[PDB]
Ligand binder design. Structure first.
Ligand SMILES: CCCCCCCCCCCCCCCCCC(=O)OC[C@H](COP(=O)([O-])OCC(O)COP(=O)([O-])OC[C@@H](COC(=O)CCCCCCCCCCCCCCCCC)OC(=O)CCCCCCCCCCCCCCCCC)OC(=O)CCCCCCCCCCCCCCCCC
Ligand SMILES: CCCCCCCCCCCCCCCCCC(=O)OC[C@H](COP(=O)([O-])OCC(O)COP(=O)([O-])OC[C@@H](COC(=O)CCCCCCCCCCCCCCCCC)OC(=O)CCCCCCCCCCCCCCCCC)OC(=O)CCCCCCCCCCCCCCCCC
Ligand SMILES: CCCCCCCCCCCCCCCCCC(=O)OC[C@H](COP(=O)([O-])OCC[N+](C)(C)C)OC(=O)CCCCCCCCCCCCCCCCC
Ligand SMILES: CCCCCCCCCCCCCCCCCC(=O)OC[C@H](COP(=O)(O)OCCN)OC(=O)CCCCCCCCCCCCCCCCC
Ligand SMILES: CCCCCCCCCCCCCCCCCC(=O)OC[C@H](COP(=O)(O)OCCN)OC(=O)CCCCCCCCCCCCCCCCC
Ligand SMILES: CCCCCCCCCCCCCCCCCC(=O)OC[C@H](COP(=O)(O)OCCN)OC(=O)CCCCCCCCCCCCCCCCC
Ligand code: SF4
Ligand code: SF4
Ligand code: SF4
Lengths: 70, 94, 145, 318, 176, 155, 186, 360
């Protein structure tokens, strides 16, 4: 019957789900739990470069808040 | 025959036909695979009298061709001209 | 809702095959999990089933034995394993199974059915069944000459 | 971690491609009143694995008349570029976030055509050459209309970034205001992927196997994987373009599930279409695009330049 | 009588012309074709589960050949050679002589099953129902030689298949 | 133990090959009509993994389905040679098996096994579609019994 | 063999060339390594190769010939060649570039072991290198192919049959007479 | 891809059928006709049987004549399903082949139930048919015919109005009525171009004069019109089959004349005359009076005829088979002028060629 085509569709669906799920999870893992910073324009890259310098650990995803202003 | 009501409706709608009335899979309407014995009839030559083979011998009635001309008035055609066909009245145009 | 009834029917098939193990056995041996009425069983272990609500062609089937004539047929099965008395019913040449309409017994009919033996040491090898046509002169065994 | 991200992209792609082959055979089978694979593994689930192993232990042939280097290069190009087409796809986050992702996908699709031309030419056989020149005709037919169809859609999104399409369609699918372009886009993707009723470069009933007729075993498998990879990718592109999924930044997997379902259904429609229609003649395909889609595409490109301006609804540049 | 298959002029009124424009632009007739294949997707397939299920056959089916016996065990064949004479393929070869009890019996009865056209003429011609075509059709071999049947093979076939053959003959002999 | 490893690898390559037999789209006469019926829904050869492919480069099996004439013999041998290996030949029907009804003709090859090696002979004129399927499954079991790697290990 | 079965026919062929040989095909396959190594540049070795069909016909005649029982034959080709000239002819017939270079015996042996590592069918071996560079013995005392009625087939008439498939598309159609033969050691 | 010349090289399935027949009795030659147009098996048998029955000067009984028309029209359904769906298969529409070959499979069962063979029945013989219909067969034919028109309706849904199908077949392979006649075309190859000709109407045989049906006529003489003619001929076949089911008469099924048709097996085993005639018919065979006839039928593929020369013995002196496809294929180069490669694929299909009959 037609519903016997579903198992292959389900397997195909799972495989197509993995790349998107894996990319999202790897991004959080490599950016301290946040989305990967998107730098489409020079301004955004400038801010990211300043974040790297400001971090103190050479990681632009390590944020510094009021605790760092004296 | 085991299709649920929803599936029957779905394929009926998609095809635009009531497919359940003329299914292409066969079920119980077919003839039984065991049948009562037959009792076949005999032909017109199964008689005990007035049945001499010479009076019903097709092969011996064949004759050699009729020689019309050999090298040993109105014009004619092989047959009357063919009558023109009529349009169908069941459905003249498809 | 019918979609709920369909699941019950499919779930019933697991019990109709005597649990998940029996269900998975028929799924992997025959690729079909339908449950039918046991029409009968032949002396080699083949089991014959019918379900007359199935369409013509799918309404009779055999689950082949797992061993026949000393051969392991758990995975290797073939249509030639069906013995002649069941062959007629399985192919729908008759309505009556041999349980109901037994075949006529003869003293020369094989008691043990054989499947296709090609490619095995029991295969058939052709030969001429007639004897030598010309008898040759045999010279004498003594020197008289 | 990025190298792991790459592997978690292309290995799933190859697995999805393998099981798409099963699904097409089953879907086609049931539309043809039969079953398709249901013996090799339960419900045929192992059938793709047997086929792949079979092909890769089959003897590959290099034809005597063939140009050796080009013969080997072409299938490598086909699969390598098929995988490359996936890296900028936002699902919802792309592996490579690009400014001109659409322009990247156009260029990579144009380059992939040479894997058909060079395989056909390098084979040095008549049916292969005929198949290759059909690809020349096919590309000429759809390429101009395809780019201009994309342009019209991108005049509502405002950029060539694929992630922007997610933002554009936050409130409503783009298929609503652009269903005429979606229709012409959908047919173009069928011609782009050499799919029925535009399966002309292969054209089995006409050319035996067209461009890949001389290919066997593993090299043949590469062309097959590339084609089915492009079928899925082109239907992912379509889902992003016209059926944009909502993206919750904190639950990105909900996007992926919804977007995967849409991509699967669009892929099924490709199989559906293949079961239903006869094949175009390859001159009739050219006239379809140039005499029908292109006039309509030019007019709708004009309309979508003016419509944002006259309604004061021009999208943001950023 | 005849009918025209393709001789109709489309209506040129505004509604008809706009119906045809919608069909052209919106692909209505192509969508209708998609509906038909969709309806088939949801129909039960016609496939049977061979070899667990078999295609139907009738008692008249012409399959593998067999040489039959009387209920006593005596061979039916009396070497008349009618089957050999009628065989359209000349697939039958026969030799005969008086048996040790004086019976008229064959010493050779070969059927070249690669010559045979499975036509059933031999079983029509046989006056004693000795040679028949049985119901077996699953006897493909690995070698050509295995299909050159001699009398021993054909008698074994008869002994192997007699239970089915006799029931099939019973079902159909009143049609012969 | 190498014996155990090669035995299992034999099962895998054998399983992959018998599970994916691609016959060449190649038919000669009336036997080819029954071959069409094996692909038709009732038997659905494709459900066994058996799929026609037109190119000999992409075929594993040649089914000689019909009479082989003298004029056709070189073309049959050509396309068989162009099949990569492993390759198999199924002889279908009396004509292909040994000439059949046309055995004594001046224009017919008396069996395709004079031209190519044959793995399975399917008898009949024509064999039923089921008979042909029985022959294909018989070929599958022949491939299952192959011992390529076990013999190589003991060379 | 001559002791167990005194009446045996023992046939001693030189290197046999044919479609499926490991002789002409072996030389033609050296092309994948660029140059063609040769011990002493092949000027110290002489070969007298024999066609496969000649050996076959000689075997078949030995079966039918009563005089052949208990004898020992030597099946050699009609011509003796220098190994260098033979390989040069092989590359000319196949239209492949010929770059012979000298390799001493110890060096050739070392590479022979390199290819012996293969668990499959070794491309070459130390033993194979030795036999190819062994001079083909002259045995006037033994009967030959002419004694069994076979007329030895020159390598010049059959080399194309073996070596046509080793060419590229450019040279596939070249005819038999286009290549000039090899110097035969008179 | 423009076709500048078509040069069909045939003979690759030439098997010297016509020479082999000279070495057979008339009965032994009958199975050779199953294997000419091996999609229209029982129609080829009927043409051979009519020719022999004409030279013998005998007549088959009425019930046999109705069976022959019934299975002739079932055979036309078999042929047209194969012709239309493989034609569509070549043109790229693969799905109708599968739907309709399930119908073919059911019609194969009718062949098997009367004759024991799915294809090469050898059922229609000079004198009548071999055996009477088994009990229950006509009910099952009726059940099949009740639903078949819906199957044709589904085929037409896929193709008839499909713009892709029309693009591939409309104005492709046009043949004028004059060219069709001079080139020796017949059947749908004439009627697609408007010629009003069908041998069942104009030169009818066994009982075709007693059934009502319409001949479909084309107006443009191209592939599309020839496709519509074959589709409408299937509907008319179902219409004829309906009348054969209702008008089937009782009686014997082969000529009651045991010097031509063998006696019944029970008679053969009781009566001396019957045994002698059974013996002689299956060995020497019936002799045919000397003469020559050209007999033709409206076969599914066109006019199928035999020129049968009898020398007075029990083996034919000469049997020339006129295959409709032979003349059609000779016209392929004419019909393919100005067309492309893919159009030649369509044109081969529209001629409906089987090389069993082209080559013999
Ligand atoms: C990825 C997608 C898949 C993941 C979701 C999986 C969801 C669960 C699937 C359940 C299917 C099991 C069917 C069943 O109960 O077996 C009955 C069967 C016994 O019932 P039966 O006697 O054969 O009767 C069948 C019906 O009479 C005759 O059959 P029927 O045609 O009448 O079908 C009955 C039922 C069966 O359907 C289902 O139960 C599943 C429905 C899920 C739909 C997903 C899409 O469907 C319905 O009742 C209609 C509602 C279903 C939605 C239909 C919508 C069609 C699409 C709309 C058209 C346009 C498309 C664009 O038992 C079995 O054979 C068990 C076999 C199990 C096969 C594997 C099932 C798992 C599939 C893969 C799982 C994921 C991995
Ligand atoms: C990843 C790379 C994929 C391609 C793999 C190529 C090697 C395939 C193995 C192979 O050729 O079979 C064995 C083949 C030997 O088999 P053969 O049949 O006896 O001889 C084949 C022909 O003689 C010679 O074979 P042919 O007829 O194909 O001609 C050789 C070559 C001609 O090569 C030349 O004439 C000079 C080299 C030109 C390439 C250098 C760049 C040319 C300007 C483009 C700039 C690109 C720079 C990179 O043809 C080409 O033009 C090669 C195109 C490579 C494009 C790479 C894409 C960049 O090659 C060798 O082992 C030597
Ligand atoms: C990469 C690894 C891929 C693993 C493929 C696993 C193969 C599974 C399989 O063989 O199916 C069960 C098969 C099914 O058996 P089968 O193929 O003989 O069944 C015949 C068809 N039926 C059952 C329908 C009658 O089991 C085996 O036969 C054992 C094969 C072992 C394969 C080698 C594994 C190592
Ligand atoms: C005939 C044989 C054919 C064989 C085929 C072999 C494969 C060929 C593959 C195609 C080659 C062309 C590749 C061009 C890549 C262009 C992609 C792109 O435009 O984005 C890449 C990125 C630019 O980033 P962007 O978003 O545009 O703006 C800056 C904000 N980050 O910038 C980058 O990521 C850095 C890119 C620099 C290196 C590019 C190298 C390309 C050179 C050709 C190889
Ligand atoms: C007639 C046949 C024509 C053949 C052509 C093929 C056409 C097939 C097209 C397939 C696509 C069908 C639409 C996909 C439905 C999937 C529904 C789903 O899974 O997601 C739910 C979605 C609503 O959620 P969402 O998309 O995020 O909201 C839009 C805001 N951006 O959507 C809500 O429903
Ligand atoms: C406010 C004012 C607004 C202003 C804007 C208004 C715009 C809307 C009104 C304009 C019309 C909109 C529709 C335009 C769609 C494109 C139309 C088209 O090009 O199709 C017509 C084309 C013509 O070809 P033909 O029929 O053979 O004859 C032509 C004679 N020269 O025929 C074809 O193309 C046939 C294609 C054959 C291949 C089809 C195979 C697939 C069929 C199934 C696809 C189903 C659709 C799926 C869409 C999914 C999208 C995700
Ligand atoms: S079935 Fe026909 S061809 Fe075969 S042996 Fe009998 S008479 Fe001869
Ligand atoms: S099998 Fe029958 S027909 Fe043939 S020789 Fe024996 S008795 Fe006569
Ligand atoms: S074996 Fe029979 S069915 Fe097959 S091609 Fe020959 S005559 Fe036709």
């Amino acid at each position: 019957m037609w519903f016997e085509v579903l198992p292959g569709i389900a397997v195909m669906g799972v495989c197509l789900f993995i790349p998107g799920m894996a990319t999202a999870r790897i991004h959080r893992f490599s950016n301290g739990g946040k989305e990967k910073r998107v730098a489409h324009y020079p301004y955004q890259w400038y801010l990211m470069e300043r974040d790297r310098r400001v971090s103190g650990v050479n990681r632009s995803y390590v944020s510094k808040g009021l605790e760092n202003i004296d | 025959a085991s299709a649920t009501r929803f599936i029957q409706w779905l394929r009926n709608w998609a095809s635009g036909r009531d497919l359940q009335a003329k299914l292409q899979l066969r079920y119980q309407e077919i003839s039984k695979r065991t049948q009562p014995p037959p009792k076949l009839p005999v032909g017109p030559s199964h008689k005990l009298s007035n049945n001499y083979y010479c009076t019903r011998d097709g092969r011996r009635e064949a004759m050699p061709p009729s020689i019309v001309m050999s090298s040993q008035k109105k014009a004619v055609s092989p047959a009357p001209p063919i009558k023109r066909w009529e349009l169908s009245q069941d459905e003249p145009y498809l | 809702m019918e979609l709920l009834q369909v699941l019950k029917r499919g779930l019933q098939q697991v019990s109709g095959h005597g649990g998940l193990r029996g269900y998975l056995r028929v799924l992997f041996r025959a690729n079909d999990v339908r449950v039918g009425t046991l029409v009968g069983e032949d002396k080699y272990g083949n089991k014959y089933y019918e379900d007359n609500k199935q369409f013509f062609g799918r309404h009779r089937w055999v689950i082949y034995t797992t061993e026949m004539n000393g051969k392991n047929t758990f995975w290797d099965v073939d249509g030639s394993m069906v013995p002649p008395e069941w062959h007629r019913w399985l192919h729908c040449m008759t309505d009556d199974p041999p349980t109901v309409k037994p075949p006529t017994a003869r003293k020369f009919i094989w008691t043990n059915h054989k499947f296709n033996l090609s490619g095995t040491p029991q295969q058939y090898v052709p030969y001429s069944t007639t004897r030598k046509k010309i008898q040759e002169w045999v010279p004498p065994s003594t020197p008289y000459k | 971690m990025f190298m792991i991200n790459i592997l978690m992209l292309i290995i799933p792609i190859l697995l999805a491609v393998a099981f798409l082959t099963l699904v097409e055979r089953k879907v086609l089978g049931y539309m043809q009143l039969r079953k398709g694979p249901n013996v090799v593994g339960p419900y045929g689930l192992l059938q793709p694995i047997a086929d792949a192993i079979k092909l890769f232990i089959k003897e590959p042939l290099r034809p005597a008349t063939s140009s050796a280097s080009m013969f080997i290069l072409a299938p490598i190009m086909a699969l390598g570029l098929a995988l490359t087409m996936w890296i900028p796809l936002p699902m919802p986050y792309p592996l490579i976030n690009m400014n001109l992702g659409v322009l990247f996908m156009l260029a990579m699709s144009s380059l992939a055509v040479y894997s058909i031309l060079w395989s056909g030419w390098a084979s040095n056989s008549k049916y292969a050459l005929i198949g290759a020149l059909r690809a020349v005709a096919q590309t000429i037919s759809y390429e101009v209309t395809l780019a201009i169809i994309l342009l019209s859609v991108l005049l509502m999104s405002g950029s060539f970034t694929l992630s922007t399409l997610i933002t554009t369609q936050e409130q409503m699918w783009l298929i609503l205001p652009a269903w005429p372009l979606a229709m012409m886009w959908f047919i173009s993707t069928l011609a782009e992927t050499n799919r029925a009723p535009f399966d002309l470069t292969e054209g089995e009933s006409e050319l035996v196997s067209g461009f890949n007729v001389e290919y066997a075993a593993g090299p043949f498998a590469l062309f097959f994987m590339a084609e089915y990879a492009n079928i899925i990718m082109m239907n992912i592109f379509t889902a992003i373009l016209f059926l944009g999924t909502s993206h919750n930044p904190h639950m990105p997997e909900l996007y992926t599930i919804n977007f995967t379902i849409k991509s699967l259904l669009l892929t099924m429609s490709f199989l559906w279409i293949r079961a239903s229609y006869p094949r175009f003649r390859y001159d009739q395909l050219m006239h379809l695009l140039w005499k029908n889609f292109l006039p309509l595409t030019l007019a709708l490109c004009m309309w979508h330049v003016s419509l944002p301006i006259l309604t004061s609804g021009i999208p943001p540049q950023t | 009588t005849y009918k025209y298959v393709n001789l109709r002029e489309p209506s040129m009124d505004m509604k008809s012309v706009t119906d045809r424009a919608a069909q052209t632009l919106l692909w209505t007739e192509l969508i209708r074709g998609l509906g038909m294949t969709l309806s088939y997707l949801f129909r039960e397939p016609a496939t049977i589960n061979y070899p667990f299920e078999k295609g139907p056959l009738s008692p008249r089916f012409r399959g593998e050949h067999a040489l039959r016996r009387y209920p006593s065990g005596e061979e039916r064949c009396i070497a008349c050679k009618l089957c050999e004479a009628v065989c359209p393929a000349q697939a039958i070869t026969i030799e005969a002589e008086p048996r040790a009890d004086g019976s008229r019996r064959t010493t050779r009865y070969d059927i070249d099953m690669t010559k045979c056209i499975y036509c059933g003429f031999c079983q029509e011609a046989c006056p004693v129902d000795a040679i028949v075509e049985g119901p077996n059709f699953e006897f493909s071999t690995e070698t050509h030689e295995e299909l050159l049947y001699n009398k021993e093979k054909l008698l074994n076939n008869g002994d192997k298949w007699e239970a089915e053959i006799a029931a099939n003959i019973q079902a159909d002999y009143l049609y012969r | 133990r190498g014996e155990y490893v090669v035995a299992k690898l034999d099962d895998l390559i054998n399983w992959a090959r018998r599970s994916s037999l691609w016959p060449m789209t190649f038919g000669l006469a009336c036997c080819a009509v029954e071959m069409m019926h094996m692909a038709a829904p009732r038997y659905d050869m494709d459900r066994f993994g058996v799929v026609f492919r037109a190119s000999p480069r992409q075929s594993d099996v040649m089914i000689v389905a019909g009479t082989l004439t003298n004029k056709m013999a070189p073309a049959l041998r050509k396309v068989y040679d162009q099949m990569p290996e492993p390759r198999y030949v199924v002889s279908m029907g009396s004509c292909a098996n040994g000439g059949g009804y046309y055995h004594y003709s001046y224009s017919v090859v008396r069996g395709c096994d004079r031209i190519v090696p044959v793995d399975i002979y399917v008898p009949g004129c024509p064999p039923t579609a089921e008979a042909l399927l029985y022959g294909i499954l018989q070929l599958q079991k022949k491939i299952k019994r192959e011992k390529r790697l076990r013999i190589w290990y003991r060379r | 063999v001559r002791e167990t079965f005194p009446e045996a026919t023992i046939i001693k062929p030189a290197e046999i060339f044919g479609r499926e040989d490991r002789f002409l095909n072996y030389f033609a396959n050296i092309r994948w390594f660029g140059g063609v190594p040769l011990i002493s540049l092949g000027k110290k070795t002489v070969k007298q190769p024999v066609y496969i069909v000649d050996v076959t016909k000689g075997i078949i005649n030995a079966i039918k010939d009563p005089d052949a029982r208990g004898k020992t034959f030597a099946f050699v080709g009609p011509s003796r060649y220098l190994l260098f000239d033979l390989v040069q002819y092989v590359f000319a017939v196949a239209h492949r570039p010929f770059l012979p270079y000298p390799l001493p015996h110890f060096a050739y042996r070392w590479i022979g072991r390199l290819f012996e590592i293969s668990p499959f069918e070794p491309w070459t071996t130390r033993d194979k290198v030795e036999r190819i560079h062994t001079t083909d013995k002259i045995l006037p005392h033994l009967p030959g192919l002419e004694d069994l009625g076979v007329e030895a087939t020159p390598l010049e008439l059959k080399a194309i049959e073996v070596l046509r498939r080793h060419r590229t598309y450019r040279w596939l159609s070249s005819e038999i007479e286009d290549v000039q033969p090899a110097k035969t050691i008179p | 891809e423009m076709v500048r010349k078509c040069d069909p090289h045939i003979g690759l399935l030439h098997r010297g059928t016509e020479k082999l027949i000279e070495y057979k009795t008339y009965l032994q030659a009958l199975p050779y006709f199953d294997r000419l147009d091996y999609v229209s098996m029982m129609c080829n048998e009927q043409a051979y049987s009519l020719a022999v029955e004409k030279l013998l000067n005998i007549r088959p009984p009425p019930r046999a004549q109705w069976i022959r028309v019934l299975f002739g029209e079932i055979t036309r359904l078999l042929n047209h399903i194969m012709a239309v769906t493989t034609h569509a298969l070549d043109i790229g529409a693969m799905t109708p082949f599968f739907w309709m070959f399930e119908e073919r499979e059911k019609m194969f069962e009718f062949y098997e139930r009367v004759s024991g063979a799915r294809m090469h029945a050898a059922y229609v013989r000079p004198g009548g048919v071999h055996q009477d219909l088994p009990l229950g067969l006509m009910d099952d034919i009726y059940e099949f015919s009740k639903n078949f028109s819906l199957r044709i309706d589904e085929l037409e849904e896929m193709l008839t109005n499909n713009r892709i199908w029309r693009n591939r077949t409309v104005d492709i392979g046009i043949v004028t009525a004059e060219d069709a006649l001079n080139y020796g075309f017949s059947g749908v190859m004439l009627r697609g171009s408007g010629i009003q000709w069908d041998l069942r109407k104009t030169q009818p045989y066994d009982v075709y004069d007693q059934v009502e049906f319409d001949v479909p006529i084309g107006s443009r003489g191209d592939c599309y019109d020839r496709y519509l003619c074959r589709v409408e001929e299937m509907r008319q076949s179902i219409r004829i089959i309906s009348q054969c089911l209702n008008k089937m008469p009782p009686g014997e099924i082969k000529v009651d004349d045991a010097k031509v048709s063998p006696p019944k097996r029970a008679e053969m085993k009781t009566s001396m005359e019957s045994l002698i005639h059974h013996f002689k018919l299956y060995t020497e065979g019936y002799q045919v009076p000397p003469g020559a006839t050209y007999t033709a039928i409206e076969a599914p593929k066109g006019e199928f005829g035999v020129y049968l020369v009898s020398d007075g013995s029990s083996r034919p002196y000469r049997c020339k088979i006129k295959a409709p496809g032979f003349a059609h294929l000779a016209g392929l180069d004419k019909m393919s002028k100005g067309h492309m490669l893919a159009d030649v694929v369509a044109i081969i299909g529209t001629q409906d060629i089987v090389f069993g009959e082209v080559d013999r």
